[PDB]
Design a protein around this nucleic acid. Structure first.
Length: 437
RNA sequence: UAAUAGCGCCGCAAUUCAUGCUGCUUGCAGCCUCUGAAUUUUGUUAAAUGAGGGUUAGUUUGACUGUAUACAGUCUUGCUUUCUGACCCUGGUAGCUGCUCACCCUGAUGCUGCUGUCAAUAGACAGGAUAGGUGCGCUCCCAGCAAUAAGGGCGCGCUGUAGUGGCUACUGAAUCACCCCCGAUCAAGGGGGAACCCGGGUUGAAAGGAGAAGUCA
DNA sequence: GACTTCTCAACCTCCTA
DNA sequence: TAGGAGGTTG
């Protein structure tokens, strides 16, 4: 699931409650470090479960389980404590304070009621969590847990500049992972379909082998309980999702001179419905692209100047590149949705060094026809000014936005040469040609 | 005193276009009114970019419902970012750390560069982001430096007190989004104005997917 | 900071209120 | 009886 998103909010409680939480978070981060050395040594994560059992009594029943999950994630990789991650829809017990504000009541923290401070841009998510738990409560456990839009969340701390306090210094911040497709009823239908198929496959696979007479029956019981409860739905808003025209393919072309260009082209026909260039996708946000290029030049010169012995290089850095890589994805997806596009085509990220090198060469021979010295000099001067874009965050942001809206993404092969509009059109057509296979 | 030239950018002009407009003939035909694209050629334009360091639980970007992408209704919380304004500053004082250096010569993706006044010492003091060059920046150029790229020479294995940096602690100013006043700042809002529009509104906007750990750049 | 992997329960099952 | 906290699992 690439459609799922993460929301955040700041929690606000008394000084005493924060004190208890800080003490427990320290008493939980201290032993999980000890669990690491024990865990890592034996391998050269199922055994980890009974590995923590002796560690239980050494120094929050649901919270000791939490540290187990974090380690498993680190292993498979190959004064703030670590976040307390809640890998359960039902770990948090939402409520509404007497003053109307929401509250969170964590499972292991019986007396720790935090007040939820968030933004109105995303208060509807917390209200949805509340309504979901309330709907389960009204139905008396007759709704499957797969559909409360709240997959998991982890509580983190944050740094402050007061420099005078153990926790008054630090700010709580809740990070709930919420499946965006789980908001509308029609999307929850597809989510229910996929989850039912997964449950069927998993139960068939597990029935095909033999397990313990009690754990196997209990897990299978939960499976059919989920299958029974999942058919009863919630009173969620209805939206017609997205239709998608198969023949219409929005082709997106990445380069150096133009950071990104698009081409809405028919595939059954051979006509381009409408091109858009980088100056036209970024409506009134083009000065942002220019100043980001200037900043990426300045920061690269500074990084080169710093050489080997340096102070931290984030001086003057920002997330302007990310803001532009999101403004661009929003515009590209909106353009796709306007023309009923069924898919957005993106270049393979692997072919993004060869493409930029070839584009630099093409510009060089375009300026200096055969004067090789001038071509090399201009290539150097161009690489000085027009730095390489960040073609990873852009492809990722488009993948997120399109998946959220409902537009599937395919990948083709960007042509080596030609005008950026022609490159985009031919990429889009090549994608359809390969889809025909 | 000098900044030629070069490259990126930004507009301003032309020209050809269509990603545009109109016409139906529905894919052709005109054109350039708009919206843009592509060349090349300009820098007057109060034309458009750009313009040191900071300052808001800042405004807008919102949800659902009914109707037809709009409007009406209801709810709304201050999270993380990005711009634009506006404002403030160009800092103390007290410790500590890092680097560099006998001298020349080359002069680096090196350093520094604003006004005014006083001295005309090398610095103060008042202003202050229009801050060396050009419409705007640069790893380019220019002026001074250059021991703090690199290399070359060359005194007695040293030349070492200065030049630059970093850090902590307590501090200074602005704690803002029409303006002021009193608050809050693990929360908390209230009060008083003014302009504009028609007792109500307005008095800038945007975007969010997080975390972990590696691989590096 | 910017690129690369990786994660995104759930009904059961007691046990106090 | 309805939450609260644990419990377990490919």
């Amino acid at each position: 699931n690439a459609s799922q998103i993460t929301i955040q909010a700041r929690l606000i409680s008394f000084e005493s409650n924060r004190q208890q939480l800080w003490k427990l978070m320290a008493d939980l981060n201290t032993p999980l470090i000890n669990e690491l050395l024990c865990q890592l040594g034996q391998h050269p994560s199922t055994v980890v479960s009974q590995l923590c059992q002796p560690l239980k009594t050494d120094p929050p029943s649901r919270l000791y389980m939490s540290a187990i999950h974090i380690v498993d994630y680190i292993y498979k990789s190959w004064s703030l404590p670590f976040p307390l991650v809640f890998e359960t829809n039902e770990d948090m017990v939402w409520s509404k304070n007497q003053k109307g504000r929401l509250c969170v009541h964590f499972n292991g923290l019986s007396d720790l009621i935090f007040e939820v401070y968030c933004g109105n841009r995303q208060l509807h998510w917390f209200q949805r969590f509340l309504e979901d738990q309330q709907t389960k409560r009204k139905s008396k456990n007759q709704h499957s847990s797969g559909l409360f839009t709240l997959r998991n969340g982890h509580l983190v701390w944050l740094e402050g500049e007061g420099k005078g306090e153990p926790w008054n210094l630090h700010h709580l911040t809740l990070y709930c992972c919420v499946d965006n497709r789980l908001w509308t009823e029609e999307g929850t239908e597809i989510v229910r379909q996929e989850k039912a198929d997964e449950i069927t496959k998993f139960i068939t696979n597990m029935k095909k082998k033999s397990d313990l007479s009690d754990t196997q029956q209990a897990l299978i019981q939960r499976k059919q309980s989920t299958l029974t409860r999942i058919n009863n739905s919630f009173e969620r808003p209805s939206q017609p999702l997205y239709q998608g025209q198969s023949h219409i393919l929005v082709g997106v072309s990445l380069g150096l001179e133009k950071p990104a260009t698009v081409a809405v082209v028919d595939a059954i026909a051979n006509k381009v419905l409408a091109y858009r260039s980088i100056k036209q996708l970024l409506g009134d946000n083009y000065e942002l692209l220019n100043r980001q290029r200037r900043q990426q030049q300045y920061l690269s010169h500074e990084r080169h100047k710093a050489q080997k012995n340096f102070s931290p290089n984030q001086f003057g850095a920002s997330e302007l590149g990310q803001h532009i890589d999101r403004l661009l994805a929003k515009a590209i997806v909106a353009l796709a949705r306007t023309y009923k596009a069924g898919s957005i085509v993106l270049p393979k990220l692997g072919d993004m060094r060869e493409v930029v090198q070839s584009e630099i060469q093409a510009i060089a021979e375009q300026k200096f026809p055969g004067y090789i010295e001038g071509q090399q000099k201009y290539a150097k001067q161009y690489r000085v000014n027009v730095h390489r874009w960040s073609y990873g965050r852009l492809i990722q942001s488009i993948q997120s936005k399109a998946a959220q809206t409902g537009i599937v993404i395919e990948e083709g092969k960007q042509p080596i040469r030609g005008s950026p509009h022609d490159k985009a059109k031919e990429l889009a057509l090549s994608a359809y040609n390969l889809r025909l296979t």
